[PDB]
């Protein structure tokens, strides 16, 4: 019997009664996973409608994704605890801590709002691994599936409750440096780990992840023992083990904005795509193509940058927007008028189009728990696109080598590679790009779904 | 053993000599150079480093191969002073501020969106070069009728000599010695291709590498498995295997000298006369924190018991003008007026001159010293400070402190980014009654004296033999 739970769902009520659950981010990954597991899924009630909709549901509500049809069992929480949380895990906190969002000289600088959160947190925490261990009461042997980085608190409690029953944790972000980690305050950083060792197997996208969780644990429990060779951590009498799950798109999942196609016609596109978040890096990716476009050649070439919308209401979200905004009016003010563009809203079949039309897709981001865009863009490219990948993606443990590799903060070494890309030619790309999309092909979400079971069944047979 | 030490600069010092009308140049005590002279196995000692005045540039071009001081105790060291061209000195000091190269070690860049490299860090980089060879070029110039020399290599800034040297002398013991902290492998990757690699390279074919902390030598491990594929670590050893050249990494911790160790700033008497004082001193660096400290306190204040309380802000000014500095005295000075604009006028004051003098009386007069820095390579006021205060005062140390390995038990140890925590330390260092303060602050001394300038450097000597005999 198999327990699955998320923090996050993004449902859309309408009418075709109606509801639905919006494509990227982790929230579908997860709910496609209740797909191919074929169960219902553990997730938060954000809004009112969904409120209302679970409680006139409580058994479960049922929505389609973006492929399937899903059975969903929303918690209601305190909407004062939750609205609270969801401050905590935004950049302000547990964003900031795990994406490396803090300069340290000016910020963080922790309050008494740190203390408050942190016990909201507790609450909320509960409020998952009561509703976890209640749905699975009934259950002779249960298996426990806890997916992110808000649920992280999660398997201690239920390791109470079933002390013999196999966990999953598994974080979809990066894990930061042990010296970044220890950033966050005394009660946090530790009590953090306290709640996510208990777990069976605790698994990322990436190695460089596990082995920084590994230091943090080294770091912050003295009354630890890990081991970098094992990928293992003991810690009074818990056993637990570290496992990298890399995961590339979903072969399910997967036209043109207004005047795009106009105004890219004779012309070599790059692309930048990602989330309205600082970590998706199109400030300096703009700055990058202006320094290759002085280095000239680049003519007949403009760039799209595509955003999509979300947690705008964050500062740094909407500071990153303005930036970026800032750095394309300053390129076509140096570059000429129309050079690049935005495009700026929230449809993903408008996104996947801008993958196929792209000579030059750039994926540098500051850092990136994955980046799935990176395997789903050349899967879709018809042009042989090159793809400008940044070191500090999960997902260059992967494509790295399949792509230009870059350093995230360096400018000249991102222009030249533009350069690079656009001055080579269609065989040479083509090459590339077939290697490309043999690298990336294996990485579905079913075998990355496959991954987790092999993963934890093993690890609980080792105990 | 023929000694050749090679750091940023020498101190020294110049008069005009009544009776002759002619410039004297002495060799002011305690430099690094002075106390190697004294050891042990050592015959003679050479000392390189760069000119820095008109005093040192027409010194340097009066004896352009260096010419030997005079020591007490009968002791003559060799001082060769390297003049540079000037651009290429210019260039690489702004290099090693917070506009490029302070960052890197010292931890100030948010990533999200700072930093951005452009050609600059590429033009620094080249007269880093320069300067590397400039230096290096010096050391074996004037180690060139020497059998079996032994190199020491202190400071940042000659990072990349090791390598020069080894070129030369396969064979010889080389000690490179890094006063400043190592950043963790994801943030020193922060660094474009040529220089994070290019560092470690003019690093590793040293015999020994020594830091001031720990956790700097593990964070250094941690650089080269990351990025020289080809190299092979040892955390049980502390040993970098890479291109047959074996590296060992030695923890040295320093306290301070004992030479060094007044009277209170104009006006700092008689506005702290019977107050309890605390005390934040440091450069005017973004690391030292003040500010964050100056919002601890406040936040102690609030709570009450802070009665009769005031707090003094020593501050050390910088020559140039670094934008990161200037921020940070802003951000400190506001800090301090909403403070003032809180608990009342004059409550918290800055300081701010040079003079190493009024930074020690102001120790001696401390009833809490903080030491919250966001990282320090080791922080030597926190020795010096316990061991000249008369008041038996309490001291809140960062955990990110070098110091902190050797003194953290014997302080009150902080989070520097948890303002809560440190306003928690403060309330609890000053509620505390004159004798457990006593007892606590004799404890503290017992643990700083030891960790002398001498100590430390009988510590490089001792360590860089044991390795170059492996
Ligand atoms: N709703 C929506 N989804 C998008 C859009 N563009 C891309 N996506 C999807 O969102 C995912 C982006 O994930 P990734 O690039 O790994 O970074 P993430 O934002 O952290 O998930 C991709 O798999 C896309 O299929 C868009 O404009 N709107
Ligand atoms: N030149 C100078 N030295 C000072 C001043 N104030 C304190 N110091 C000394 O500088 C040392 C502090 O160094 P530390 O905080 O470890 O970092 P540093 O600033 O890089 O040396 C102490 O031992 C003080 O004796 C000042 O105003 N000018
Ligand atoms: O601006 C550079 C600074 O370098 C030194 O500071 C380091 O060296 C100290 C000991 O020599 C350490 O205690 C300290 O942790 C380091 O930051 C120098 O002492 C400073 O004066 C310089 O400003």
């Given at each position: 019997?198999?327990?699955?739970?998320?923090?996050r769902?993004?449902?859309?009520?309408?009418?075709?009664?109606?509801?639905?659950?919006?494509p990227?981010?982790?929230?579908?990954?997860?709910?496609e996973?209740?797909?191919?597991?074929?169960?219902?899924w553990?997730?938060?009630a954000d809004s009112?409608?969904?409120?209302?909709?679970?409680?006139?549901?409580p058994?479960?509500?049922?929505?389609?994704?973006?492929?399937?049809?899903?059975?969903?069992?929303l918690?209601?929480?305190?909407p004062?605890?939750?609205?609270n949380v969801?401050?905590?895990?935004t950049?302000?906190?547990?964003?900031?801590?795990?994406?490396?969002?803090?300069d340290?000289?000016?910020?963080?600088?922790?309050?008494?709002?740190?203390?408050?959160?942190?016990?909201?947190?507790?609450?909320?925490?509960?409020?998952?691994?009561?509703?976890?261990?209640?749905?699975?009461?009934?259950?002779?042997?249960?298996?426990?599936?806890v997916?992110?980085?808000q649920?992280?608190?999660?398997?201690?409690?239920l390791?109470?409750?079933?002390?013999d029953?196999?966990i999953?944790?598994?974080?979809?972000?990066?894990?930061?440096?042990?010296?970044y980690?220890?950033?966050?305050p005394?009660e946090?950083?530790?009590?953090?780990?306290?709640?996510?060792?208990?777990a069976?197997?605790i698994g990322?996208?990436?190695?460089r992840w596990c082995?920084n969780?590994?230091?943090?644990?080294?770091?912050?429990?003295?009354?630890?023992?890990?081991?970098?060779?094992?990928?293992?951590?003991?810690?009074?009498?818990?056993?637990?083990?570290?496992?990298?799950?890399?995961?590339?798109?979903?072969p399910?999942?997967?036209?043109?904005p207004?005047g795009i196609?106009?105004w890219?016609?004779?012309?070599?596109?790059?692309?930048?795509?990602?989330?309205?978040d600082?970590?998706?890096?199109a400030?300096?990716?703009?700055?990058?193509?202006?320094?290759?476009?002085?280095?000239?050649?680049?003519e007949?070439?403009?760039?799209?940058?595509?955003?999509?919308?979300?947690?705008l209401?964050?500062?740094?979200n909407?500071?990153?927007?303005?930036?970026?905004?800032?750095?394309?009016?300053?390129?076509?003010?140096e570059?000429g008028?129309?050079?690049?563009?935005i495009?700026?809203?929230?449809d993903?079949n408008?996104?996947?189009?801008?993958?196929?039309?792209?000579?030059?897709?750039?994926?540098?981001s500051?850092?990136?728990?994955?980046?799935?865009?990176?395997?789903?863009a050349?899967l879709?490219?018809?042009?042989?696109?090159?793809?400008?990948?940044?070191?500090?993606?999960?997902?260059?443990?992967?494509?790295?080598?399949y792509?230009?590799?870059?350093?995230?903060?360096?400018?000249?070494e991102?222009?030249?590679?533009?350069?690079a890309?656009?001055?080579?030619?269609?065989?040479?790309?083509?090459?590339?790009?077939?290697?490309?999309?043999?690298?990336?092909?294996?990485?579905?979400?079913?075998?990355?779904?496959?991954?987790?079971?092999?993963?934890?069944?093993?690890?609980?047979?080792?105990?």
């Open positions: 019997e198999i327990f699955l739970a998320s923090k769902a993004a449902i859309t009520y309408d009418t075709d009664p109606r509801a639905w659950l919006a990227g981010g982790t929230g579908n990954v997860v709910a996973q209740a797909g191919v597991l074929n169960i219902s553990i997730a938060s009112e409608d969904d409120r209302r909709a679970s409680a006139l549901n058994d479960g509500v049922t929505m389609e994704l973006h492929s399937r049809e899903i059975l969903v069992r918690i209601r929480h305190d004062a605890v939750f609205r969801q401050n905590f895990m950049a302000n906190l547990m964003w900031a801590a795990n994406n490396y969002g803090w340290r000289w000016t910020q963080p600088s922790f309050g008494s709002d740190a203390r408050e959160g942190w016990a909201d947190f507790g609450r909320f925490t509960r409020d998952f691994a009561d509703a976890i261990l209640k749905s699975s009461a009934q259950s002779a042997d249960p298996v426990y599936l997916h992110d980085y649920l992280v608190g999660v398997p201690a409690l390791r109470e409750q079933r002390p029953a196999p999953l944790l598994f974080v979809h972000i990066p894990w930061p440096s042990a010296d980690w220890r950033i966050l005394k946090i950083r530790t009590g953090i780990l306290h709640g996510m060792l208990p069976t197997t990322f996208f990436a190695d082995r969780f590994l230091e943090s644990v080294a770091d912050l429990l003295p009354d630890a023992r890990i081991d970098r060779e094992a990928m293992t951590v003991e810690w009074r009498g818990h056993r637990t083990r570290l496992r990298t799950m890399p995961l590339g798109y979903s399910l999942t997967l036209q043109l207004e196609e106009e890219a016609d004779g012309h070599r596109l790059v692309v930048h795509s990602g989330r309205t600082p970590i998706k890096n400030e300096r990716a703009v700055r990058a193509f202006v320094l290759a476009a002085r280095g000239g050649g680049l007949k070439t403009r760039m799209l940058v595509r955003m999509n919308p979300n947690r209401y964050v500062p740094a909407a500071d990153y927007v303005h930036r970026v905004e800032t750095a394309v009016a300053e390129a076509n003010a570059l008028s129309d050079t690049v563009r495009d700026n809203d929230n993903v408008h996104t996947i189009a801008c993958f196929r039309r792209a000579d030059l897709l750039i994926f540098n500051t850092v990136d728990g994955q980046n799935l865009s990176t395997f789903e050349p879709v490219n018809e042009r042989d696109a090159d793809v400008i990948l940044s070191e500090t993606c999960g997902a260059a443990e992967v494509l790295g080598e792509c230009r590799s870059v350093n995230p903060f360096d400018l000249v991102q222009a030249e590679a533009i350069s890309a656009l001055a080579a030619g269609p065989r040479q790309r083509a090459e590339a790009a077939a290697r490309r999309r043999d690298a990336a092909r294996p990485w579905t979400l079913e075998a990355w779904v496959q991954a987790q079971l092999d993963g934890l069944a093993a690890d609980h047979a080792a105990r």
